[PDB]
Each structure stands twice: as C-alpha cells, then as structure tokens.
Amino acid sequence: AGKKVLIVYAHQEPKSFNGSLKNVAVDELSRQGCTVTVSDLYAMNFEPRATDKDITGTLSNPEVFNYGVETHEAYKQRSLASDITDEQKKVREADLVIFQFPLYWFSVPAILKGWMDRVLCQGFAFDIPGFYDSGLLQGKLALLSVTTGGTAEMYTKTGVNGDSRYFLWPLQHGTLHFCGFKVLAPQISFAPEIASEEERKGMVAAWSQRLQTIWKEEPIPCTAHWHFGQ
Amino acid sequence: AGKKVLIVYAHQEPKSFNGSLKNVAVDELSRQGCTVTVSDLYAMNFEPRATDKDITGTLSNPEVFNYGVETHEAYKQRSLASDITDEQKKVREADLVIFQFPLYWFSVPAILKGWMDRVLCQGFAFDIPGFYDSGLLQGKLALLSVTTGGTAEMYTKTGVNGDSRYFLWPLQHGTLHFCGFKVLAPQISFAPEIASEEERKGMVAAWSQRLQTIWKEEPIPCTAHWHFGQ
Ligand SMILES: Cc1cc2nc3c(=O)[nH]c(=O)nc-3n(C[C@H](O)[C@H](O)[C@H](O)COP(=O)(O)OP(=O)(O)OC[C@H]3O[C@@H](n4cnc5c(N)ncnc54)[C@H](O)[C@@H]3O)c2cc1C
Ligand SMILES: Cc1cc2nc3c(=O)[nH]c(=O)nc-3n(C[C@H](O)[C@H](O)[C@H](O)COP(=O)(O)OP(=O)(O)OC[C@H]3O[C@@H](n4cnc5c(N)ncnc54)[C@H](O)[C@@H]3O)c2cc1C
Ligand SMILES: COc1ccc2[nH]cc(CCNC(C)=O)c2c1
Ligand SMILES: COc1ccc2[nH]cc(CCNC(C)=O)c2c1
Ligand SMILES: [Zn+2]
Ligand SMILES: [Zn+2]
C-alpha cells in the first residue's frame, strides 16, 4: 500500500497463462492496499505504429518527417495524440511498472514494442542529456514478467537459446535503465504450455508469493556484467 | 538463374537516411540484374498486432485463443490473412532478405517487429525440428542494415550502450538464425543525424559499394561467442 502500480499487459487471451499471471498480480497488489492500473494493450487495440498521426500540431519540419524530433517537440507543446498522453499519465503516477508478456522472438510482442516506442518519448522518459542513471523516470521501479515457449534448460549459456539474461539486455538496459528506471529481477515463467498442472499452478503461486514482498526487493545491477558475465 | 532480393523497409519518410539506403540498395541490386521487391511497411500501413484476425474462417479452438497454435494450423490449412501470405510469398521466393530500419530501443521499430511476429510463423519459418541450422528458411541469406542515434563509441564493450553485438542477439540469433537464415554481417550506419554531409554521402556510398560484392560474402558464425565472446 502507499504505492501505485501500472501493469502493461500484452496477451490476447484472458484465459491464458499470461492472463493468470496478470490477474494474480492485480489480486495480490490489490490485497496489499496498493493502487493498481492495467493497460491491456490488445483489448485497447493499442496503436503500435510510430507515425505522423502521433502529432496533432504544426510540425517543426513538414518537409522531412523525423519521428523523434517531432514527438519530442509535440511532448513539450502538448500536441501528442491522446492515447500516448493517457499512457504517460499512468507511468508518471506509478511507483512500479510491471510488464506482463509472452516472449516473441526473444523480445516483446509488437503491440508492446509499440507502447515502448510511442510512450517513452524524449522529454518524457529521457532527454539528451538525461538518460541511464539520469533518465527522467528515475525513482521508479520496473519489472519484466515473461513467459517462454522454451524450457529453462534451453535458456542457459550452454543451451540452444543462450542464457535468458542475454535477451533481456535491450529491454532492461537499453530501454528501462536508459529511461532511469531501477530494474527489479525478472520473473521468468518457463514453458507453461509444456508444464503440467502442478507446475503451472506452482508458477502462478510463485509469482503471487514473490509479490507479497516485492517492496522489500533491491533492483539488479543493470550492467553488462550482470547480463553477460565474466 | 539470377538472384532475388526482398528488402523489408521500416521508415516513415522517403527523404530519410534510411530511405536513401533503401533506394541505393534497390538501385545497385537492380543494376546487377537481380530481382528486387520492397515491402515498405509504413506505406502499406502494415498491421503489427498478432490477433485472431490473422486466421480466416474458423479457429481450431475458439474457446481459448492461442496465437502460435492457431497460426501454425492456419498456415497448414492455407487460412492465414492475405497480408501475411503475401509477405510469405516474397520471403519464400527470396535468396536474400535485407531489413532496413532505424534502431528503436535497441531493436526494430514495432511495425517491423510485427512483420517478424506475424510473417515468420511455425510451419513457414521454423518447426520441430527445423530451427537454427535446420530452420525452414535455410539456404537463404539475411542482413540487418541498421541506423542508430548513438555514436560508434557509445556502442563499445565499455561504452554506455554496450557492444552493438549485444543488441543484435535477439535479431540475428534469436530470429534470423532460428529460422535457418545464414546471416551476413550487419550494416551499421552509426549516428547519421550527427554526421556531416560528406560522412553521410560516405556511409551511403559504402553501403552501395558493399552491395557490389554481397554475393561473395560468407555468413557470420551466428553463435553466442560471436556476439559476446572475446
Ligand atoms: C509470434 C510468436 C513468437 C514467439 N517467439 C518465442 C521466443 O522467442 N522464445 C520462446 O521461448 N518462445 C517464443 N514463443 C512462445 C511463447 O512465448 C509462448 O507460447 C508463451 O510464452 C506461452 O504463454 P501463454 O500465456 O500464451 O500460454 P498458454 O497457452 O495460455 O499456456 C499455459 C497453460 O496453462 C493453463 N493455465 C492458465 N492459467 C492457469 C492457472 N491459473 N493455473 C494453471 N494453469 C493455468 C492454460 O490453460 C494453458 O494450458 C513465441 C510465440 C509466438 C506466437
Ligand atoms: C522510438 C525511437 C527509439 C529509438 N531508440 C534508439 C536506440 O535504442 N538506440 C539508438 O542508438 N538510437 C535510437 N533511436 C534513434 C534512431 O535510431 C535514429 O534517429 C535513426 O537511426 C536515424 O536514422 P534516420 O534515417 O531516421 O535519419 P535522418 O534524420 O533521416 O538522417 C538523414 C540526414 O542526413 C541528411 N543527408 C545528407 N546526405 C544524405 C544522404 N546521402 N542520404 C540521406 N540523407 C542525407 C538528411 O538531409 C538528413 O538530415 C530511436 C529513435 C526513436 C524515434
Ligand atoms: C508458436 O510460435 C512460435 C514462434 C517463434 C518461436 N521461437 C521459439 C519458439 C518456441 C520454441 N520452444 C520449444 C523448444 O518448443 C517459438 C514459437
Ligand atoms: C538509446 O535509446 C534512445 C532512445 C531514443 C532516442 N532518440 C535519439 C537517440 C539518440 C541520441 N544519441 C545521442 C548521440 O545523443 C535515442 C536513443
Ligand atoms: Zn542497465
Ligand atoms: Zn546464431
């Protein structure tokens, strides 16, 4: 309690394992007295494309469109599309942002990549200068709760997919830490489609249990060493 | 006889540096006598979201929607949406697929992430046991031509962003190699926005020149060692 959480959720099916992980997070954080908001991207038909429709005012350079430049100015002028502004309000108010999603091509599903691309604009999430430890979302926590098709064994240094931490780099470091977030350790629920009932129920309960003490956790040192080793 | 190339292009502005790199690739490959096709994703208003609209007719399990299962079965039953099958035909016929895009959050812009999520479905691009070296698109070459906002120095092992090979992992290994592609060395045009006209025309010319001998290149060894090792 005394804390606000935003869950950005990317799964098409409410009855899915991802849906269960999202719901147990809402249930537990709600039980604790926290304020909780969920952005259910597919239900919202969230727009993933970075286009000129994201700026409603006079463009700074109408001859040659540069998304980064135009959205940075639009942010400062308050002429960004309202769907972006609505997400920014949720992020600005949140103390913790949890991303719940199935891994798609070692990354986030495109609808969620679009949320990253359009919501975390210059001026709001970072500035130049004003990134990594000086990012604009400093003071906030972020956590990736991911599900995979591959087993934990396949996601090891000697497994076919390499260690799971490798694919986390662009997301935890390149995006979240870049914007100033401190990153909590990822929650990775491996191969639920293959797992049995005991195992699946076990994974949901492990997440619920972890959430009970989430406010006591320290963030990870989001560095190349943590991700790649040596 | 001859070679066929598909360029999957993701930039909103034809006058952009990315647009110029795409245009010189078309110009040079065409000059060589190659068959060239371009999927200009923003112009096509390409759908990035993975949804149940990607399957036509009736679902294999209309009670609990599973995107991966449904698209695998739709591929086998020739029931995928036409935008997806149109892209699959271009890929099936291509000997080389060049992805041209600006780096967005250490990855591809969401519209291109959506093309990978929706076009590279099970049965078409990979299956059990067709993945990595036995991926279904084996025999085809793939190449990432990326532009960045960050300078080359920032993308060094000890630079703030880490080595560029770190972010290439999910794309080169987790996506392209996984589907069986032999991956040519990436073309990285660092910070064209900061560079001078000469450094610019230079980066373009370097890409045009590389394309002159693209068919003589050998694929990189797509391994954890290549991306992280020393
Ligand atoms: C485009 C695409 C790209 C992909 N790329 C990758 C990749 O790069 N790497 C990778 O490893 N995988 C990849 N995958 C696989 C994907 O990550 C998995 O399919 C996904 O993570 C599984 O999560 P889910 O919620 O969809 O599972 P579900 O299909 O929902 O399976 C979970 C099972 O648990 C049951 N369940 C639900 N809730 C509960 C509950 N409360 N208690 C007990 N059981 C419950 C369900 O009914 C179901 O049978 C990809 C998939 C697609 C479609
Ligand atoms: C959502 C988002 C997220 C991002 N995340 C990242 C990230 O993770 N890491 C990162 O490093 N960067 C990131 N960026 C920055 C992005 O990668 C760069 O802005 C992009 O790569 C620059 O390419 P461009 O084609 O848009 O450049 P342009 O701005 O189009 O640059 C071309 C410039 O060169 C001039 N020019 C002169 N000669 C030529 C010629 N020969 N051909 C063409 N133009 C010429 C043009 O007139 C123009 O001014 C992000 C940007 C956005 C919007
Ligand atoms: C259903 O669609 C997809 C699409 C792209 C994918 N990449 C990887 C996997 C799962 C692979 N796990 C195992 C070992 O079975 C995958 C599934
Ligand atoms: C790493 O993440 C991002 C995200 C959005 C961005 N927009 C622009 C840049 C690059 C700016 N580089 C310099 C040299 O200052 C950028 C980087
Ligand atoms: Zn970091
Ligand atoms: Zn590889």
Side-chain angles (χ1 to χ4, degrees):
Chain A
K3 298 291 185 175
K4 300 176 179 300
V5 182
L6 168 64
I7 300 175
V8 182
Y9 167 71
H11 201 288
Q12 310 89 343
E13 177 55 66
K15 303 169 188 165
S16 67
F17 189 72
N18 270 270
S20 297
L21 291 174
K22 180 265 286 174
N23 293 329
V24 306
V26 171
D27 292 345
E28 174 53 30
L29 294 163
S30 186
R31 177 195 75 71
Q32 288 178 29
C34 300
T35 293
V36 186
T37 304
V38 179
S39 284
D40 179 344
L41 302 183
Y42 289 104
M44 294 163 71
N45 291 320
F46 191 78
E47 172 61 66
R49 306 175 193 85
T51 76
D52 63 9
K53 296 304 73 173
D54 294 348
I55 299 99
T56 64
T58 306
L59 299 166
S60 50
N61 183 342
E63 302 294 60
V64 181
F65 186 71
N66 182 303
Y67 190 81
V69 166
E70 298 297 348
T71 55
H72 180 200
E73 175 71 10
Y75 176 74
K76 290 187 297 184
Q77 292 300 326
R78 298 191 188 132
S79 57
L80 284 167
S82 68
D83 63 332
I84 291 172
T85 291
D86 286 345
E87 294 308 296
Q88 293 181 340
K89 181 168 175 177
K90 297 164 195 181
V91 173
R92 179 179 294 112
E93 298 186 345
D95 295 297
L96 167 66
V97 183
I98 295 170
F99 296 88
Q100 179 61 59
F101 61 95
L103 191 70
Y104 273 19
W105 292 119
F106 276 42
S107 184
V108 291
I111 195 170
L112 175 53
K113 181 55 161 57
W115 186 101
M116 300 297 192
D117 296 346
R118 300 172 69 241
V119 176
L120 305 173
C121 75
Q122 187 170 350
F124 173 66
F126 68 94
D127 219 322
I128 301 294
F131 57 85
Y132 282 126
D133 289 349
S134 54
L136 306 180
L137 302 181
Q138 53 186 274
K140 299 182 186 305
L141 299 167
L143 190 169
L144 303 175
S145 176
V146 190
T147 66
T148 68
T151 61
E153 158 71 302
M154 294 173 242
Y155 280 107
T156 57
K157 293 172 237 171
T158 61
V160 285
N161 295 332
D163 191 63
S164 56
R165 296 186 178 188
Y166 300 161
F167 73 64
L168 296 172
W169 176 251
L171 303 169
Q172 296 189 150
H173 186 77
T175 307
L176 302 174
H177 184 181
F178 186 88
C179 296
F181 287 103
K182 283 297 193 173
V183 181
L184 295 186
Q187 185 67 12
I188 307 180
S189 304
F190 293 103
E193 283 170 282
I194 288 178
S196 72
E197 275 294 298
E198 304 84 58
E199 299 172 302
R200 278 169 290 192
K201 293 285 183 57
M203 285 188 283
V204 173
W207 174 224
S208 189
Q209 171 61 66
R210 177 176 176 195
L211 285 173
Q212 293 175 26
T213 53
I214 199 72
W215 304 106
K216 180 206 98 205
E217 300 191 7
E218 292 299 334
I220 63 171
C222 188
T223 61
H225 175 264
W226 185 88
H227 288 87
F228 306 113
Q230 197 342 315
Chain B
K3 295 295 188 192
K4 300 173 171 185
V5 182
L6 168 65
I7 301 170
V8 184
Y9 166 71
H11 199 287
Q12 310 92 338
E13 174 59 63
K15 303 175 191 163
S16 68
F17 190 64
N18 270 269
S20 292
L21 294 177
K22 180 264 288 173
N23 290 334
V24 290
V26 170
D27 287 348
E28 173 57 30
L29 293 165
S30 296
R31 180 198 70 74
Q32 283 176 34
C34 296
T35 293
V36 183
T37 306
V38 179
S39 284
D40 183 336
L41 301 185
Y42 289 102
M44 296 165 69
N45 186 37
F46 192 78
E47 170 64 69
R49 307 172 192 86
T51 72
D52 62 4
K53 295 181 182 302
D54 294 350
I55 299 88
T56 63
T58 70
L59 301 179
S60 83
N61 189 331
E63 300 283 63
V64 175
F65 185 66
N66 183 304
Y67 191 78
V69 169
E70 299 283 352
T71 56
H72 184 194
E73 300 296 304
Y75 179 75
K76 291 190 286 189
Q77 305 312 316
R78 308 161 304 286
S79 282
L80 290 165
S82 66
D83 62 338
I84 290 171
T85 63
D86 283 349
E87 293 310 296
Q88 294 180 338
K89 181 182 170 171
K90 297 170 193 175
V91 174
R92 179 179 295 113
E93 302 187 345
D95 292 296
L96 165 68
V97 182
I98 296 174
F99 295 89
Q100 180 64 59
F101 60 97
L103 194 68
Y104 276 19
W105 293 120
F106 276 40
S107 185
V108 290
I111 195 170
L112 174 53
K113 184 50 160 63
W115 184 98
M116 301 164 164
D117 298 345
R118 295 172 75 239
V119 176
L120 305 177
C121 73
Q122 192 172 338
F124 175 65
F126 68 89
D127 209 324
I128 309 133
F131 63 90
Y132 282 128
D133 284 357
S134 55
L136 306 182
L137 304 177
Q138 51 182 285
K140 297 184 189 304
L141 298 165
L143 184 170
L144 300 178
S145 178
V146 196
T147 61
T148 69
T151 63
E153 204 89 304
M154 295 177 228
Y155 283 101
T156 49
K157 285 277 185 174
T158 58
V160 290
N161 296 333
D163 196 292
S164 53
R165 297 191 171 189
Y166 291 162
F167 72 72
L168 298 171
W169 178 250
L171 298 172
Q172 287 191 163
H173 182 79
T175 306
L176 302 175
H177 186 183
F178 187 92
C179 296
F181 287 108
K182 294 303 187 185
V183 184
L184 296 182
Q187 183 73 7
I188 308 185
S189 301
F190 290 103
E193 288 167 285
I194 290 183
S196 54
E197 282 292 307
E198 307 74 63
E199 303 180 311
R200 217 118 58 186
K201 296 297 205 58
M203 305 187 94
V204 175
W207 171 230
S208 189
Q209 283 189 45
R210 174 178 179 187
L211 288 172
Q212 294 183 196
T213 54
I214 201 77
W215 312 104
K216 282 68 195 173
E217 297 183 16
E218 322 175 322
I220 61 163
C222 205
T223 60
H225 187 311
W226 186 92
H227 291 81
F228 316 119
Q230 174 56 292

